[PDB]
Amino acid sequence: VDTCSLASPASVCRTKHLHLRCSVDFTRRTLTGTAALTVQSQEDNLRSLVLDTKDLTIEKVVINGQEVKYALGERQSYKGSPMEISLPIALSKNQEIVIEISFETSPKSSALQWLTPEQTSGKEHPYLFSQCQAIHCRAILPCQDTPSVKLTYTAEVSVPKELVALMSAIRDGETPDPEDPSRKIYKFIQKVPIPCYLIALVVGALESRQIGPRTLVWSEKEQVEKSAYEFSETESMLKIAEDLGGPYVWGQYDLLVLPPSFPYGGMENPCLTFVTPTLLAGDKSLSNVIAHEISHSWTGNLVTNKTWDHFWLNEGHTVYLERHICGRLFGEKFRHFNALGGWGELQNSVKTFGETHPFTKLVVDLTDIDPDVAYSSVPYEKGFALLFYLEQLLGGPEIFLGFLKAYVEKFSYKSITTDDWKDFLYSYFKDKVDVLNQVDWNAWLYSPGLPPIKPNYDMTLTNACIALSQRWITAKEDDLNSFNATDLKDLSSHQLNEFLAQTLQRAPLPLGHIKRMQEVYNFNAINNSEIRFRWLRLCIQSKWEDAIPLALKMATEQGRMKFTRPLFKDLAAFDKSHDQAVRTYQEHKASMHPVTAMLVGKDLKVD
Ligand SMILES: OC1CCN(Cc2ccc(Oc3ccc(-c4ccn[nH]4)cn3)cn2)CC1
Ligand SMILES: [Yb+3]
Ligand SMILES: [Yb+3]
Ligand SMILES: [Yb+3]
Numbered sequence: 001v002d003t004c005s006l007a008s009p010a011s012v013c014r015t016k017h018l019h020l021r022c023s024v025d026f027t028r029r030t031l032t033g034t035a036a037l038t039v040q041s042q043e044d045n046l047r048s049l050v051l052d053t054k055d056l057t058i059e060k061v062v063i064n065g066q067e068v069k070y071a072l073g074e075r076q077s078y079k080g081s082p083m084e085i086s087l088p089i090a091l092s093k094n095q096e097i098v099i100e101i102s103f104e105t106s107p108k109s110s111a112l113q114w115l116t117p118e119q120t121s122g123k124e125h126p127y128l129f130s131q132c133q134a135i136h137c138r139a140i141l142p143c144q145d146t147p148s149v150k151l152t153y154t155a156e157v158s159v160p161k162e163l164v165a166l167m168s169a170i171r172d173g174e175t176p177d178p179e180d181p182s183r184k185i186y187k188f189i190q191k192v193p194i195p196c197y198l199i200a201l202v203v204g205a206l207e208s209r210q211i212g213p214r215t216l217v218w219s220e221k222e223q224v225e226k227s228a229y230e231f232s233e234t235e236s237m238l239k240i241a242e243d244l245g246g247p248y249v250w251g252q253y254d255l256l257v258l259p260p261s262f263p264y265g266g267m268e269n270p271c272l273t274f275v276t277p278t279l280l281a282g283d284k285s286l287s288n289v290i291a292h293e294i295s296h297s298w299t300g301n302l303v304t305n306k307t308w309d310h311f312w313l314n315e316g317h318t319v320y321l322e323r324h325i326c327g328r329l330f331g332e333k334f335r336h337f338n339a340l341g342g343w344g345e346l347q348n349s350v351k352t353f354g355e356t357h358p359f360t361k362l363v364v365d366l367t368d369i370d371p372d373v374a375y376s377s378v379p380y381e382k383g384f385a386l387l388f389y390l391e392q393l394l395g396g397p398e399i400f401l402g403f404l405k406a407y408v409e410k411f412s413y414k415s416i417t418t419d420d421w422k423d424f425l426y427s428y429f430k431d432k433v434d435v436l437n438q439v440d441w442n443a444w445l446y447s448p449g450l451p452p453i454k455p456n457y458d459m460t461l462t463n464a465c466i467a468l469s470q471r472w473i474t475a476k477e478d479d480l481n482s483f484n485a486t487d488l489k490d491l492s493s494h495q496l497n498e499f500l501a502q503t504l505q506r507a508p509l510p511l512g513h514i515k516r517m518q519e520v521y522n523f524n525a526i527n528n529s530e531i532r533f534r535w536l537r538l539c540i541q542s543k544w545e546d547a548i549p550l551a552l553k554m555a556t557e558q559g560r561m562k563f564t565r566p567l568f569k570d571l572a573a574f575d576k577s578h579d580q581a582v583r584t585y586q587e588h589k590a591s592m593h594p595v596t597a598m599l600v601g602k603d604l605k606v607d
């Protein structure tokens with residue numbers, strides 16, 4: 001039933017375990033290894049199973065200790081290639097057989113990003129990291145690349161003795177390689193069933209420091225110190241999150257601070273989450289991105305989406321818990337401010353992509369469409385917009401959180417669709433069905449544009465941001481002298497970012513307005529990756545030539561697509577930077593991430 005896959009569905013075949021024995025050769029830029037898939041049959045007399053590949057070369061397929069005949073079909077863009085494996089002898093229902101595939105990756109694989117020592121914040125050692133979400137585990141190893149299949153895994157990775165190898169699992173051992181003395185083999189065990197898109201590897205000159213009874217923060221020697229401070233609230237957040245979903249059954253929770261290159265704020269990888277170094281502002285304000293990945297240990301890591309059309313079930317429900325952690329740490333005044341900010345981001349994505357556009361619906365049709373392209377603010381904020389509306393109809397926070405605690409409990413270790421969620425939303429609230437029936441279902445789930453109902457948000461914290469935003473938009477030439485550093489003497493870092501976000505929706509503003517802002521507030525001096533981003537966009541949209549060097553620099557400074565893609569598109573629209581925007585892309589294309597370079601290129605109209 002999964003459009004984004006070329007393999008046999010869960011109804012025909014199901015993978016139960018995976019044993020990965022590989023080596024990381026940085027000279028060759030490949031992942032030399034053998035994958036042992038303890039595959040189970042769900043049909044009587046199964047003669048052949050199909051698997052997902054992309055940029056792979058197979059040496060041999062070993063079943064029962066013998067070479068078997070395998071066939072690889074014709075390549076289909078982002079989906080990759082189907083790998084039909086002819087079985088030696090037919091399978092019965094629930095009959096488990098191991099398949100050892102001797103794969104070989106590509107140095108230009110869409111999942112892995114190979115780093116030159118110069119690209120790292122160590123300058124003396126190389127770095128390697130993956131990103132299997134959504135359809136990129138096929139670019140690492142041949143498997144049933146579908147979130148309709150949850151599997152366990154045990155792994156052994158051979159890397160040089162001078163490096164540290166880490167996976168999305170709990171570590172077991174540490175011993176040197178037998179037929180390579182300059183190498184060390186690291187063991188990883190994942191007893192908890194997890195889909196292939198959540199499997200991740202990271203190798204490099206890493207170092208760890210404890211920040212609580214179950215957390216380890218991983219980054220290079222000269223990045224550990226501020227990593228310990230910025231995410232020091234993780235232990236307290238986890239204790240709060242447990243009273244929202246249930247027990248934390250993963251053993252250890254770790255944070256891994258990636259090099260700038262990483263294209264996402266955070267990735268929900270179990271036992272070892274993936275975070276961007278841009279989160280480090282030094283004040284602990286970007287801590288909500290940690291609250292999002294903690295919340296993912298319940299939604300996405302326990303209750304996973306069966307197909308990618310139902311992705312909103314992951315992020316949307318996670319944004320609810322993320323704001324609830326912040327709404328138990330900083331109050332309901334903050335939870336409502338963030339929820340109001342969410343609609344704001346949603347408005348920006350709906351106006352950009354288009355109102356009647358297909359990728360603005362909550363359940364979209366990913367037939368002949370790449371999920372990495374269709375990624376926007378719709379499954380995050382529109383998915384939350386639904387939940388917050390339901391909450392303000394069925395009761396309140398305590399009542400709706402009670403539904404989610406039962407929801408995680410009901411579909412734990414399982415892969416579900418939007419149809420499965422709506423049944424439980426009607427089964428849990430079996431007495432408040434009258435309220436549930438008032439809700440237009442086709443308008444929130446299958447219709448494009450803004451949702452038909454805008455919920456009620458507490459404007460207590462948000463009003464100040466709007467007051468200062470409206471002050472600038474309404475201001476004339478003579479009015480600009482009224483603005484002083486006094487203006488933001490009470491506005492917080494989140495409120496300063498909200499003011500910039502509100503102004504950017506009404507951008508471009510006169511060039512004199514922008515110039516004045518820097519003369520009194522000094523927005524260039526700030527090191528907050530969220531504040532700096534919107535401010536740079538505001539100048540480039542308003543045609544400020546002084547901002548061109550800074551705007552280009554921020555896009556090369558980091559790899560997060562939340563900030564790089566807007567910048568490179570902004571400078572492409574702006575006449576005095578259109579050439580530089582293109583020139584920087586092609587000169588930095590080699591150093592870029594295979595996902596970052598792919599999406600930026602299309603937005604710049606470059607092949
Ligand atoms: O923190 C996370 C951030 C995102 N991933 C990468 C990623 C990209 C796309 C994706 O698949 C999608 C996205 C949106 C929709 C959709 C449905 C209705 N509208 N839009 C459907 N499928 C899944 N993962 C990395 C870690
Ligand atoms: Yb052990
Ligand atoms: Yb039902
Ligand atoms: Yb005036």
Ligand SMILES: [Zn+2]
Nearest residue numbers: 266268292315
């Ligand atoms: Zn997420």
